C-alpha cells in the first residue's frame, strides 16, 4: 500500500528486501538496476554503531576513518570521493541542508533511524545536487498503531553516558492516529584528554489517516550538541615516523580546555503527506525547515615549529553560524499498463533554499610542547575578521519511468536544475553572484532470471556547485560525474541470503586544480575511480546470521596542474573487506544468548595528495554478547555487552596532509540494559 516514497521491504536481522532510495518508490533491491546496500536497525544495534558514519563501517564502497575517531561530523567516503563526504546525508527523503562551506553540517543521531539505505554513484536524476560517490538516506523511526515502550541505559568506558526512551502507539479508538516520542540524553568523554561529548535530543512524531487513500505524518526534531567532542588532527612527522625518538598520545589534546567550545543547536521541522487519487495515481509530497545554531572556538596544531625543538605551531578558528534551510520535494507517480508492460512513471519537483550567517574569526596562539604539554596561554593574535552571508537556490523538475515487461525491467532518469550559490563578504562589502541550468540523465537495464539472478548494466550522472573562486573570486562552473555500472545480483528463491557484485568507472570533470605557487584556481581537472564491490549477507539457522564485504577502488587525478596527475588521492584504500556473524541460541541452558563478533580490514592509505608515504593497513575486531534474560522469565528486559578495535590498536585512521594526520579509535566498550513493555 502506498509505495512512492516509501521502502515497504521485509527485513530479516542484517537484510532487507526493499528500497527507494534509488526509486523514490518501493521498488525490490533485486529488480533495481543500482548498487544498493540497507543497514538495519539491528545491524546498527547489535555492531554497537554510535553513529551514521560508524553504522557502515561493514559497508562496501565506503571508507569509514577519513577524520578518524571524532564524532562531530559524518565523514562517509564513497569510491573514494572524499572532497565533500559531509554532503552525502538524505534524511526521509530530503537533503540534511548543511553547509559544506561552512561549520554548520548536522548529525542525525541513529537512535531516531531504523533504518540506513545507501545508493551508489551518480545518483542525481531523483535527488539533484549530490557526488559522484553516491548517497546516504535515513529513514527515522515513524508512529507504530499499536503500544511499544521502550527505555535504555549504556554505561561504556570512556565515561560513555546514554540514555533514552522511544515511546509510541495509537491515540485513536479507530487507530487512524499514531503518535511516537524518541528522546535520549547522552554524554561522553573520548579517548582524548579534556573533550566531552553531549547530546540532547527529542523527536515528537504524529501520523493521521483522513480517508482509507490519504496520509499525513509530522516530524519534529530538536538536537542539542553542548559539547563536540574532538574534531583536531595532529602532524605525519610524531605519527607515522618518530618524532626525535618519541611520537605522540592516542589522548593527544592539541588544543585549549581555557578556550575548548562547539555548541551546535539542530531545530528541524516537517511532515511527509501521502495521498491516493486512483489505484494509478498516487502522489506525495515531503518538506522539511530547519534552523541551527553553531558556536565554535578551537586552537589546534598547524605543523612543526622551526624555531622550538618539539612544539607544534597553533592557530585559532572561532565562528558564530546561524543556518536557515527548507526543502520540499512534490511527487506525482501513475502506475499503470500497456500491453505487456507495467508503466510505473514519476514526475516531480523539488525546491531548497539554505542561507547562512557566519562570523568567523582567526589568529595565532601559543606552541604546544606535543609530548608531555603545558596548558594555560590562551591569548590569540587574532586576524582580520571573515563575516559572509551565503545563500543558496536549487529547483529542481525530475521524470523517470520504471518498465516492467518480461523480465526485463528498464529504468529511465530526466532532471533539469537550476541553482543559484550567492556570497556577500560582509567585512568587505562584495558579494559573488552565480547561476546555473545542468540536465542529468540516469538509465539501467536488468533481465531477471527465474532462479533469483539479475544481471544489470546502469550509466548515470551527478552535478554539485564547485566550492572554489574562479582567479576572479567567482564560483567556477560545477562538477560533473558520469557513471558505467556492471553488477550482478543474486538470491534463491527459499533463501534469506542475498549476493551483490558491482563492476562501476566514475569519471569527474571540472574539478578545481591550478599551478601550486600560483594561488588562482581553474576548472579543467578531472578525478577517475573505478572498481569492484562484493557483498554478501546469509542466514545459515535462525539463529546464524552473516554480512561479508570485499571493496577495489583504482582512483586517479587524471588531469591536475597541482602537479598530481597520474596520482591516487589521499584517504583511498585501494582495497577493504569486513565480515560479521552473530550466533542465538535456540532452546537448552543458553537460549536467550546471542554471541557475535567480525572484523574489518582497510588497505593502505596515502597521507598526502604528492604520494610521497602510504599509511598502516589496519584490522580491527568487534566483538559482542547478549542475553535475552526474558528466557529466565523477565519478558521485554534485555542486555547487551559490546567491545569494538578488542585489539585496543594505536594506528591513525588517515591524513589529509603531511601537517595533518587523524588517530584511530580505541577499543570502545558497551554495555546496555533495554527493558519494553
Ligand atoms: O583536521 C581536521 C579535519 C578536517 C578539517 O577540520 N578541516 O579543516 C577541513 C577538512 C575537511 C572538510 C570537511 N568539512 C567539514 O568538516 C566542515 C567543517 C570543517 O571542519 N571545515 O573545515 C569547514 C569549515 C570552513 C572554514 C575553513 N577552515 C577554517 O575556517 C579553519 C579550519 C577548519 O576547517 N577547521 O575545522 C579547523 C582546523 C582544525 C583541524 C581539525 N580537523
Ligand atoms: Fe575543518
Known amino acids: 500500500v502506498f509505495a512512492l516514497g516509501n521502502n515497504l521491504g521485509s527485513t530479516d536481522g ?33 555492531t554497537a554503531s554510535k553513529t551514521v558514519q560508524q553504522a557502515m563501517r561493514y559497508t562496501p564502497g565506503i571508507f569509514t576513518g577519513q577524520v578518524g575517531a571524532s564524532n562531530r561530523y559524518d565523514y562517509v567516503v564513497m569510491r573514494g570521493f572524499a572532497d565533500n563526504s559531509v554532503d552525502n546525508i538524505y534524511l526521509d527523503g530530503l537533503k540534511a541542508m548543511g553547509d559544506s562551506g561552512t561549520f554548520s553540517s548536522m548529525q542525525v543521531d541513529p537512535y531516531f533511524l531504523e533504518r ?48 533514552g526512551f522511544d515511546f509510541s502507539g495509537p491515540l ?10 524518541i528522546g535520549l540524553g547522552k554524554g561522553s568523554d573520548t579517548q582524548f584528554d579534556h573533550v566531552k561529548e553531549e547530546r540532547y535530543a527529542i523527536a515528537p512524531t504524529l501520523a493521521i489517516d483522513f480517508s482509507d487513500d490519504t496520509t499525513l505524518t509530522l516530524q519534529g526534531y530538536l538536537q542539542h550538541d553542548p559539547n563536540g567532542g574532538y574534531h583536531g588532527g595532529v602532524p605525519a612527522d610524531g605519527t607515522l615516523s618518530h618524532h626525535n625518538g618519541r611520537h605522540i598520545s592516542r589522548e593527544f589534546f592539541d588544543g585549549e580546555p581555557s578556550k575548548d567550545d562547539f555548541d551546535r543547536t539542530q531545530r528541524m521541522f516537517g511532515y511527509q503527506l501521502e495521498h491516493r487519487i486512483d489505484d494509478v495515481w498516487s502522489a506525495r509530497q515531503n518538506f522539511r525547515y530547519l534552523d541551527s545554531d553553531v558556536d565554535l572556538s578551537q586552537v589546534y596544531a598547524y605543523g612543526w615549529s622551526a624555531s622550538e625543538p618539539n612544539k607544534l605551531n597553533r592557530y585559532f578558528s572561532g565562528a558564530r553560524e546561524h543556518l536557515q534551510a527548507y526543502i520540499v520535494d512534490n511527487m506525482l507517480q501513475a502506475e499503470f499498463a500497456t500491453g505487456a508492460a507495467r508503466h510505473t512513471l514519476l514526475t516531480g519537483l523539488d525546491y531548497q533554499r539554505r542561507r547562512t550567517v557566519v562570523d568567523w574569526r582567526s589568529g595565532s596562539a601559543s606552541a604546544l610542547d606535543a609530548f608531555n604539554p603545558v596548558y594555560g596561554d590562551d591569548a590569540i593574535s587574532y586576524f582580520p575578521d571573515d563575516n559572509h552571508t551565503r545563500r543558496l537556490e536549487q529547483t529542481g523538475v525530475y521524470l523517470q519511468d520504471l518498465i516492467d515487461i518480461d523480465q526485463w525491467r528498464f529504468s529511465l532518469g530526466l532532471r533539469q536544475d537550476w541553482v543559484s550559490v550567492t556570497d556577500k563578504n560582509r567585512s568587505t562589502g562584495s558579494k559573488a553572484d552565480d547561476d546555473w541550468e545542468k540536465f542529468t540523465g540516469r538509465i539501467g537495464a536488468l533481465y531477471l532470471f527465474d532462479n533469483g539472478l539479475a544481471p544489470y548494466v546502469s ?37 534469506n541470503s542475498f549476493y551483490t557484485a558491482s563492476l562501476f568507472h566514475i569519471t569527474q570533470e571540472n574539478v578545481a586544480s591550478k599551478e601550486p605557487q600560483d594561488n588562482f584556481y581553474t576548472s579543467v581537472g578531472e578525478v577517475r575511480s573505478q572498481g569492484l564491490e562484493l557483498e554478501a549477507h546469509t542466514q545459515l539457522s535462525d539463529n546464524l546470521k552473516l554480512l561479508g564485504s570485499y571493496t577495489y577502488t583504482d582512483i586517479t587525478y587524471t588531469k591536475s596542474l597541482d602537479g598530481n596527475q597520474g596520482h591516487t588521492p589521499n584517504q583511498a584504500p585501494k582495497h577493504m573487506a569486513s565480515l560479521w556473524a552473530d550466533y542465538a541460541f535456540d532452546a537448552g541452558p543458553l537460549s536467550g544468548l546471542s554471541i557475535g563478533g567480525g572484523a574489518r580490514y582497510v588497505g593502505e592509505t596515502w597521507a598526502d595528495k604528492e604520494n610521497t608515504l602510504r599509511v598502516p593497513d589496519y584490522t580491527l575486531v568487534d566483538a559482542r554478547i547478549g542475553y535475552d534474560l526474558g528466557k529466565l522469565g523477565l519478558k521485554g528486559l534485555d542486555v547487551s555487552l559490546n ?11 588517515s591524513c589529509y596532509s603531511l601537517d595533518f594526520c587523524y588517530f584511530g579509535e580505541k577499543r570502545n566498550v558497551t554495555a546496555t540494559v533495554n527493558y519494553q513493555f
Open 459 to 495: 550509466y548515470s550522472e551527478s552535478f554539485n556547485p564547485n566550492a572554489y573562486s574562479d582567479a576572479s573570486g567567482t564560483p567556477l562552473a560545477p562538477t560533473e560525474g558520469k557513471q558505467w555500472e556492471l553488477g550482478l545480483k543474486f538470491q534463491a528463491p527459499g533463501s
Open 172 to 181: 485513536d479508538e479507530e487507530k487512524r492516529i499514531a503518535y511516537r516520542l
Open 643 to 653: 567491545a569494538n578495535n578488542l585489539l585496543d590498536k594505536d594506528y591513525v585512521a
Open 116 to 163: 540506513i539505505d545507501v545508493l551508489k554513484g551518480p545518483s542525481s536524476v531523483l535527488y539533484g545536487r549530490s557526488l559522484p560517490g553516491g548517497l546516504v538516506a535515513l529513514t527515522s523511526k515513524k508512529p507504530l498503531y499499536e503500544d511499544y515502550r521502550q527505555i535504555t541505559g549504556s554505561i561504556g568506558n570512556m565515561g560513555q553516558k546514554e540514555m
Open 14 to 46: 542484517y537484510l532487507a528486501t526493499h528500497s527507494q532510495i534509488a526509486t523514490k518508490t518501493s521498488k525490490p533491491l533485486l529488480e533495481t538496476s543500482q548498487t544498493v546496500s540497507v543497514i538495519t536497525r539491528e545491524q546498527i544495534d547489535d
